[PDB]
Design a protein around this ligand. Structure first.
Ligand SMILES: Nc1ncnc2c1ncn2[C@@H]1O[C@H](COP(=O)(O)OP(=O)(O)OP(=O)(O)O)[C@@H](O)[C@H]1O
Ligand SMILES: Nc1ncnc2c1ncn2[C@@H]1O[C@H](COP(=O)(O)OP(=O)(O)OP(=O)(O)O)[C@@H](O)[C@H]1O
Ligand SMILES: [Mg+2]
Ligand SMILES: [Mg+2]
Lengths: 235, 235
């Protein structure tokens, strides 16, 4: 129901890239995290997901501090994650890519894994790429496959690190509906992207980060005229 | 059990890189596939595992033709695979890398996954790297982690594609001992590597391929005396 990060801090050498960052995502809502290149968004995703150790802070699900849980146990509790950088298996076919994911699924039979594979391919308009290898896909084809992989894991909370990069405008609409639809079924989404228009359109609320600190919080319409935010991020 | 490949063939352009290759491994044996760079060893491995389509040939386990099964279904039937190129997750720690694989394990409870993790890390002498990230490891540390990952999947048959590249001589001896131990437990092994002396030492018999044809077979002593093998491979 509730995923909360409190007082996250991270430094490299001594560059404070995240300091005292707190945020919350509830199931059945889409929440943004936006900000300048290097502001510390991917780093906060790392700390929530469990891939770098934090300098300070706590990760909580439903009044349960899971800060000491390793990555795999946090994923078992429902945290999913789409990396920013490419993560498709380059030698595997699209279908193989999604099946490697659906292997983890103790809630689906062999037949239901099959159908879920086809279903995702049809939803993302990639069924014609079924037997294409990862390495032979175009930039947007590859990204949409990676989004489908991350969804195929059926998380409770999904952190999407720049899902729209390389993605055409029509697929960006299509993906927004896939995500809206899963939100309706209780999926919590934390999303970052620099396609600000399309991202804010689907967000119920959003956080703004800049040089490692939160500098704003609220609706799309609100964020779009916070004076600090126009100066440091929007133009 | 018995894993057989029969009459495998594969061509790219007007270059047939594998032609009429047949191989077999039984549980409880270690078998080599050796031969010049480009001879078609990795290509054969891809056809057995299921990542490249075959031009001709059949894959059989015991009395079952599994040629039509996809990669995930062949792995469920007990085919395992260590890729030649790097496959570690670069942003995960050694421990996370191991746990991500031990997630697929229906036969181990959460406590038993973690004992298997520590057990693997101590057998490969990598426990001091437990929380080091994939990308910051040396070449042989990275390779040893990749072998542990492939064995963590508990296959019935494992195809090891150049496991000793980058690995120091002491760890080579250690790895030979770890796989001889799993051989004694019923694991079948198909191994290819250019450390000829060390690889033939643990093989009971081997095949020599050159330009995609089998040109020799037999014990290590037989392989090493064959004049065809000296000329095209040993030099
Ligand atoms: N291992 C590292 N060592 C030193 N500095 C690092 C390391 N990793 C990241 N940084 C720095 O920390 C800052 C923030 O990294 P981060 O990836 O969190 O940015 P981001 O908010 O995701 O931005 P973008 O919008 O460009 O993706 C960057 O300026 C980056 O160069
Ligand atoms: N996609 C491709 N297109 C064209 N040629 C290819 C392709 N993939 C592999 N080859 C060629 O197939 C031949 C066999 O490759 P393979 O990877 O099977 O060799 P190997 O026996 O594994 O050699 P090494 O001992 O260097 O790993 C090579 O000469 C390679 O150049
Ligand atoms: Mg980033
Ligand atoms: Mg090879």
């Amino acid at each position: 129901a509730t995923l909360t990060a409190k007082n996250l801090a991270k430094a490299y050498k001594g560059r404070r890239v995240v300091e005292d960052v707190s945020l919350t995502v509830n199931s059945g809502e889409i929440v943004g995290l936006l900000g300048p290149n290097g502001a510390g968004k991917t780093t906060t995703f790392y700390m929530v997901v469990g891939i770098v150790p934090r300098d300070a802070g706590n990760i909580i699900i439903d009044d349960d501090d899971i800060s000491l849980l390793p990555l795999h146990a946090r994923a078992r509790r429902g945290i999913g994650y789409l990396p920013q950088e490419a993560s498709i298996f380059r030698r595997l076919s699209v279908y193989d890519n999604l099946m490697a994911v659906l292997q983890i699924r103790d809630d689906l039979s062999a037949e239901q894994r099959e159908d879920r594979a086809n279903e995702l391919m049809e939803e993302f308009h990639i069924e014609h790429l079924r037997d294409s290898m990862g390495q032979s896909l175009s930039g947007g084809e590859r990204r949409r496959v990676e989004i489908a992989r991350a969804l195929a894991a059926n998380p409770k909370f999904i952190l999407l690190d720049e899902p729209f990069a390389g993605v055409d405008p029509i697929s960006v609409i299509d993906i927004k509906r896939i995500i809206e639809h899963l939100r309706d079924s209780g999926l919590g989404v934390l999303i970052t992207d620099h396609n600000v228009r399309e991202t804010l359109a689907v967000c119920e609320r959003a956080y703004i980060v800049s040089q490692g600190h939160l500098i704003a919080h609220g609706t799309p319409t609100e964020i779009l005229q916070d004076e600090h935010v126009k100066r440091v991020y929007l133009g």
